[PDB]
Symmetry: C3
Subunit: 55 residues, 3 copies
Amino acid sequence: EDRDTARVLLIMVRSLLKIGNPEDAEEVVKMIEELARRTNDPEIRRLLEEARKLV
Amino acid sequence: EDRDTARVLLIMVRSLLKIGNPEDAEEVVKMIEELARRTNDPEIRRLLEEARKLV
Amino acid sequence: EDRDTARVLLIMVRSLLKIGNPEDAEEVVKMIEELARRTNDPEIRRLLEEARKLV
Ligand SMILES: N[C@]12C[C@H]3C[C@H](C[C@H](C3)C1)C2
């Protein structure tokens, strides 16, 4: 499920920031963004914005 | 491949508990439950059970 | 995408080494190996060698 992959990637973003690695978190944000592009899901869009906001 | 996904998610569950985020770990258990429900693989079911036990 | 998956796994290798679970880090390298063998994608093999160097 596309939405499920996006929620796992958001959790990765949060954890990567917690261990002081925003450069890896930002790499994952890019994947959520391409997920939001391929689909048209406003939930995946919401997760992308939350991810960008944490980063 | 579905079994490798289950293994990756289990490692995430373990890692998230290690860094003190059981709420995110539980969310990853839910992702393994969705995987187990669309597959029916005895090893995926075994990985889901041992993730459940960490939580 | 398989390349996105390999990037996610490399990030997991680095993060797992950072939190002190080299054994899980090595398991994820194994998954990159599986991915590298199924695909023979040259970028996935590059990411594999990057992961191996960290371990
Ligand atoms: N497709 C994915 C499988 C596994 C869980 C999550 C993050 C990574 C590893 C890629 C989705």
